[PDB]
Design the sequence.
């Protein structure tokens, strides 16, 4: 899928059924840069226009790294202007992945730190390998998680654990992540990608138009309290009842 | 309790102390229909006007089903008009049960799927039997949980598990439900009703006027961020200090 | 730290590195009164103006009590006027502790009930000893948790467990608290203070200006939905990139 | 209307068609006290249960005063406890009048100052006599408009004029009030009551069930942004289409 | 503009510079029906993809009617299903016109009642002819303004005048509309279209990319309080500073 | 007042009673630059710590310009980094002036365009001279009002007139500004400063502690719907009743 456009070779896309497998391919640490952040946004835009795609899996190339976060080549020095543009690209890329019209599954096959973890927080579901370690260590260098980490992390794991990770710089492993809600499924070494593609196959058995309508409803509390969406819930239910 | 009005025989009510035991009695699957959804709303309205009632337990008649959700007799065919009215009745019935002035305890004695699960999400506390299985499989038929499921489920279990259940159609058992926050207590087969009635007895030992005032405060985040309620919290605290 | 001002001897402060150790010293139950609630607010105000302080630990003097909540000497009788002023002092003291510019760690060394538990909910992180028991039993005397308990408790543990504690008056121990998210770390008897001071030392290794900026961002959902803060997140990220 | 219950002789009620004419009768200044604030809330509760009442007019007895605000007999001295209870009674009385299920019309026949003005802000529509003068002069005695004035006044007239009245203690006459949106219609001396009863007669020509449903929708922005109500608008539109 | 697609002859579109002139052409009263509501949404979608279009004017064909609101052919009888679909089409058509990426100007050349008025409320700016009369008389037939009228009308004119129009069924003329904020400019008979096209020409002198970015910011209070957008304001300001 | 610190000679401060008269002194157009935006924030910080100051007037030196907005020396070229810092300084300076603890009065003595108008929108009350002209013409150069103009302007004048000014680049004079709510008082040439200082004297007759408490309440709708502040209103009313 994404068969043709200027897609960076740092992001490989393969079609497996109704599922798009995205692999971060940037050695040695599967780090995110400008080229890949631009390609990610564009790629999500085309997958939202591909009606053959009901699901999405992203994972890191190789067995060691899911993603080590932001390249150092970007928050270089130095340039104040670079930093701002880079924070922009992270938001645009990960908000787009967040707004994927199907379901997105993060197959955490290793270290997911900083921006790599924020990328997985951007996905709908996370599947981590037993040895995987995740953290947001930006405060250690006087910075912060600018790709949504300050909001997404406490959203799943709660404020206590979120500031244990960000404010105290403590990393967590897959089994601790499962205990606190950061991940939904722990699997053995080398089983995330596979596990993710198989969970992405269960989605292709559901009505795609129902998935696309339901998902924004589930994320409703991210912009507005849940009770404010209940009338909208019935309305989209009737919209789904129409057209069988 | 609810000693006299036109209450459908599909909903049996028995008074045990300061507790109203509601039993869904609609074989074979304790399914919800129009008659029972109307009776539920009306029943909650009278229990809110009965000052002898401090608590509430709902459970499914029989050992197999808590509730299998919406009757097929309602989202029949077909009629676009039926579907809309039915989504309305679900909201009105379960929002009323949600707005019960005392505490409500769901004693999940079996399958609670779709609308049956939304009914239990409407209650304050859930107690599940070990063998009980719960899901929201509406997306499998191109529909959605229209009785609050798209908001209530992620509210307790988080977005990851909520779309694991809704978007991926994966069901969960009582022990998984406990791990993710969907239920608060797991008990052995045939022990939910009993467990629920005994938890409903601890409530009758607390000031009822304090329960009625406190409960809306606890649900405050469902309509508005928690910090916006703090001045209101002290105000209702003084209201409780008045009248001893 | 807090080396000089009128600080009540009911609140002892000792400086350990970049960490301020606050100890509730009011026998026999480390109860909160007017004098201590005033001193707490004032103390947090000076710690926010002490740039030598990056973290904060509060704990109860002695091995038995963290804090038994509100003194009876305050919600005395009786005076309607007293009650209101007291609810005010709780809010002001614990909202200030909540708004501490560094990280605050509750070292629960025993019973933390009512206002004592609300004090620990006010802190960023909670570390409980195995034998510690926590509850909000205000509804048992016809009152309510007026120091933020009705909002803070469901915020961490969810609505089900929050009303299990408040509406049903059921207390929880440290291992149950860990299971539900009320605490982040369980430790053995006599190890909380120590554990807390060592977690407070990891914070002094991070940029303080990053901690002060990040923490309000993490608590953003308490006043406004998380998505509304994302542009602000990047903006404060660039503010942190400036000044290296 | 309100034909029988313990209604204080300080509040006279007369039935004119489908309209309830409420007259503040407390010389010399039509001031609000505890007895009248309690009676007002109770009176609105019964008018909401009287299906013969589609509209409501309140005005001051005599030609000189609509209402001079709060009695001095209440924020007496002195008692801290009195003040709090009194602020409570104002809110409860005027929020109830605000939540009247039909339309309420303030016929301002004279001075409406402080609580008298807040009473008229509580009504749906205001009709002022040419000589009428309105202000919120609470800040002049070190207090504030505690019956909703700090929110209702800028809601209609804008922040500039609202703090011109409250923060600068400047009063306005009926013609200035019309220019800024504080009133909707200016009439000649002795014509407000009459004008109000005739506007209240136009309401009795509309579907009452439509008025009761529509009015909360119009006030939707007072609790939540307008766009959040649009799905609810259609839903209540279909509810009105049902039952013809 | 909109040079080619299935556009209903009930909606005529002509290109005048960078401005699209939309004319409701449905005698005798320029009423809105299903065919025209579908065409309106589609038309706005294509104008948002036409980079040659910076502005938009809608007006009624003929000198007598701007729009008399909803056709009777739709809320026919009767069918409950029809009513719901029709409320849906109004929302979708007018929310799209509301979300036009350029500026939209309503040239009110006559009666604009009910849905016709809601259509003009959907536009950015309103220019009314002296003889034009506007109202929302839905409550007179037991219905309500389902195309946003219950939210848009008080948004501009305030609650008092909004329920004077809706709850009391009182219509307003162009000079009263100007006094209350319902319209921004009053012009003489036969001068609205012309006035609107000339105001739409001033827009083509501004940066289009600035108009598209600014307009959502101006409407920010419709979904969220204004202070929550200020960081976003600077961010889009820098986005505009980039690309010159 | 502001008797001693590094205050830029571009901002002259004179003490007249309990009022601080701030005069933008930067020829020829009273334009805002970095030096003056920094000094403004600092100046407001010290006036908030001066208990001798109850009010504030800002106006432009000379008879021709109130303020022509942002210096060209700042959004120079060119530097992307400059633009961002400058948008930051505007927000910080005008949000501080907005958050002045007393009342602030803009005495518009001439042109107030772009940032000059945003400065006056930041004040509580605006008094304009008859010849004064105001606009936000940023969209004409492909930019936007980054100092709050996109939120403050529609907040007072409504969306129609706000986008008439911003999206259509149409300027308004003092008499049009009065008609639409942009200003509260129009005065003759050379009378604004004087008028403002005399309105600032009426404020010094009110309780300062009441002004400081009330003003945030009036601006409550800028961050949260008005109904959410009503319990807080009574609470601060009792806080004002305490301490006489």
Sequence:
């Amino acid at each position: 899928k994404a068969s043709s456009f200027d897609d960076t070779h740092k992001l490989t896309v393969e079609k497996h059924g109704h599922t798009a497998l995205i692999t971060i391919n940037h050695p040695p640490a599967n780090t995110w840069d400008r080229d890949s952040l631009i390609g990610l946004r564009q790629l999500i835009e085309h997958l939202n226009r591909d009606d053959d795609i009901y699901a999405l899996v992203v994972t890191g190339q190789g067995p060691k790294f899911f993603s080590a976060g932001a390249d150092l080549n970007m928050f270089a020095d130095g340039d104040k202007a670079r930093a701002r543009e880079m924070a922009r690209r992270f938001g645009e890329a990960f908000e787009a992945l967040r707004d994927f019209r199907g379901v997105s599954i993060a197959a955490i096959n290793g270290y997911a730190m900083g921006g790599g973890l924020e990328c997985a927080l951007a996905c709908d579901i996370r599947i981590a390998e037993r040895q995987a370690q995740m953290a947001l260590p930006e405060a250690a260098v006087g910075l912060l998680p600018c790709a949504g980490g300050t909001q997404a992390l406490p959203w799943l794991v709660g404020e206590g654990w979120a500031k244990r990770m960000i404010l105290c710089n403590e990393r967590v492993d897959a089994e601790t992540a499962l205990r606190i809600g950061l991940v939904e499924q722990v699997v053995d070494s080398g089983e995330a990608r596979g596990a993710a593609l198989l969970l992405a196959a269960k989605v292709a058995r559901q009505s795609p138009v129902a998935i696309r309508t339901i998902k924004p409803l589930i994320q409703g509390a991210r912009e507005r309290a849940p009770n404010t969406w209940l009338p909208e819930e019935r309305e989209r239910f009737v919209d789904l009842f129409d057209a069988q």
The first helix of chain E runs from residue 34 to 47.
